[PDB]
Design a protein around this motif. Structure first.
Motif, PDB file in Angstrom:
ATOM      1  N   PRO A  75      65.028   1.350 -23.467  1.00 23.19           N
ATOM      2  CA  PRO A  75      66.485   1.374 -23.607  1.00 23.19           C
ATOM      3  C   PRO A  75      67.109   1.479 -22.218  1.00 23.19           C
ATOM      4  O   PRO A  75      66.484   2.005 -21.289  1.00 23.19           O
ATOM      5  CB  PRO A  75      66.729   2.628 -24.437  1.00 23.19           C
ATOM      6  N   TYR A  76      68.334   0.981 -22.068  1.00 30.01           N
ATOM      7  CA  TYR A  76      68.999   1.063 -20.779  1.00 30.01           C
ATOM      8  C   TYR A  76      69.449   2.493 -20.518  1.00 30.01           C
ATOM      9  O   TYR A  76      69.627   3.278 -21.444  1.00 30.01           O
ATOM     10  CB  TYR A  76      70.204   0.121 -20.713  1.00 30.01           C
ATOM     11  N   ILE A  81      77.667   1.621 -22.453  1.00 31.48           N
ATOM     12  CA  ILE A  81      78.241   0.570 -21.628  1.00 31.48           C
ATOM     13  C   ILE A  81      79.150  -0.275 -22.510  1.00 31.48           C
ATOM     14  O   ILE A  81      78.816  -0.573 -23.657  1.00 31.48           O
ATOM     15  CB  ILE A  81      77.153  -0.335 -20.992  1.00 31.48           C
ATOM     16  N   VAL A  87      70.091  -6.619 -15.684  1.00 28.11           N
ATOM     17  CA  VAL A  87      69.126  -5.986 -14.794  1.00 28.11           C
ATOM     18  C   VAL A  87      67.990  -6.928 -14.385  1.00 28.11           C
ATOM     19  O   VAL A  87      68.055  -8.136 -14.626  1.00 28.11           O
ATOM     20  CB  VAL A  87      68.515  -4.749 -15.475  1.00 28.11           C
ATOM     21  N   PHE A 105      67.607 -10.164 -17.030  1.00 30.22           N
ATOM     22  CA  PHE A 105      67.700  -9.858 -18.445  1.00 30.22           C
ATOM     23  C   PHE A 105      68.924  -8.987 -18.560  1.00 30.22           C
ATOM     24  O   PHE A 105      69.045  -7.991 -17.850  1.00 30.22           O
ATOM     25  CB  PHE A 105      66.490  -9.092 -18.958  1.00 30.22           C
ATOM     26  N   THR A 106      69.842  -9.351 -19.446  1.00 28.03           N
ATOM     27  CA  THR A 106      71.050  -8.560 -19.566  1.00 28.03           C
ATOM     28  C   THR A 106      71.160  -7.766 -20.856  1.00 28.03           C
ATOM     29  O   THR A 106      71.023  -8.294 -21.958  1.00 28.03           O
ATOM     30  CB  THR A 106      72.320  -9.441 -19.343  1.00 28.03           C
ATOM     31  N   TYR A 107      71.375  -6.466 -20.688  1.00 31.65           N
ATOM     32  CA  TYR A 107      71.532  -5.548 -21.796  1.00 31.65           C
ATOM     33  C   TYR A 107      72.923  -5.753 -22.385  1.00 31.65           C
ATOM     34  O   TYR A 107      73.885  -5.964 -21.649  1.00 31.65           O
ATOM     35  CB  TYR A 107      71.380  -4.116 -21.299  1.00 31.65           C
ATOM     36  N   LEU A 108      73.029  -5.690 -23.708  1.00 30.35           N
ATOM     37  CA  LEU A 108      74.303  -5.888 -24.388  1.00 30.35           C
ATOM     38  C   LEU A 108      74.812  -4.584 -24.990  1.00 30.35           C
ATOM     39  O   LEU A 108      74.026  -3.737 -25.404  1.00 30.35           O
ATOM     40  CB  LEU A 108      74.140  -6.947 -25.478  1.00 30.35           C
ATOM     41  N   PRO A 109      76.144  -4.401 -25.031  1.00 30.84           N
ATOM     42  CA  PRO A 109      76.740  -3.180 -25.591  1.00 30.84           C
ATOM     43  C   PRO A 109      76.407  -2.983 -27.070  1.00 30.84           C
ATOM     44  O   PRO A 109      76.042  -3.935 -27.767  1.00 30.84           O
ATOM     45  CB  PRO A 109      78.237  -3.392 -25.362  1.00 30.84           C
ATOM     46  N   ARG A 110      76.535  -1.746 -27.542  1.00 31.44           N
ATOM     47  CA  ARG A 110      76.258  -1.414 -28.939  1.00 31.44           C
ATOM     48  C   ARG A 110      77.306  -2.014 -29.873  1.00 31.44           C
ATOM     49  O   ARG A 110      76.893  -2.617 -30.887  1.00 31.44           O
ATOM     50  CB  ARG A 110      76.224   0.107 -29.113  1.00 31.44           C
TER      51      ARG A 110
END
Lengths: 110, 110
Positions: A75-76, A81, A87, A105-110
């Motif tokens: 998890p980020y 965010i 990242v 690779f880009t983490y996306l908001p919840r």
């Protein structure tokens, strides 16, 4: 070795899957499949029905040996965010700690 | 071997690509990547930014050796089909003519 129509099937050769399950009857389309051990200089891909048979076109240069790693992402740092955060993702050898170049690779908001 | 931040990068290890380029910041998501030669018992996948670092979770059993064949499909016998026709796709060794079990692929109308 088991009889199947006019040819002999074996459990040696095996197709794991085809990237696309359909395409234009026109042909000439570029696809790729995953398979078990095959000798690039002694292999072919065939399309057929009970009365028709067509061969795919490719070369030894089109038979790629690769490695796939299936895994669970961590998890980020920040779960709250509100905007996409991209990242770095890279490989690291455990013994000597040497790494590979990174890939985004880009983490996306919840 | 070249300095990159606090670690050492090399051209030996390399990630060819990640199946998905984004995902939930929540993590725990299952992904897979393609890479060059890595030793399953001596490898890891890391996610990081300049100040944060997270490790993906997987096992030696998750490092799969595979073979991909990129190719051009042959055209179907009948180009004037008005309905989807799904045929067979299989591998055949040239030397002994032995084949693999088939996998379906359906040709689509023009």
């Amino acid at each position: 070795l088991v009889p199947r129509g006019s040819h002999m099937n074996t459990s040696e050769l095996r197709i794991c899957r085809i990237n696309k399950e359909s395409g234009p009857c026109t042909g000439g389309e570029e696809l790729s499949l995953l398979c078990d051990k095959v000798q690039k200089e002694d292999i072919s891909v065939v399309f057929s029905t009970a009365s028709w048979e067509g061969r795919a076109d490719f070369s030894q240069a089109d038979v790629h040996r690769q490695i796939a790693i299936v895994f669970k992402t961590p998890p980020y740092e920040d779960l709250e965010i509100s905007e996409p955060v991209t990242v770095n993702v890279f490989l690291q050898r455990l013994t000597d700690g040497v790494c590979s170049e990174p890939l985004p690779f880009t983490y996306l908001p919840r």
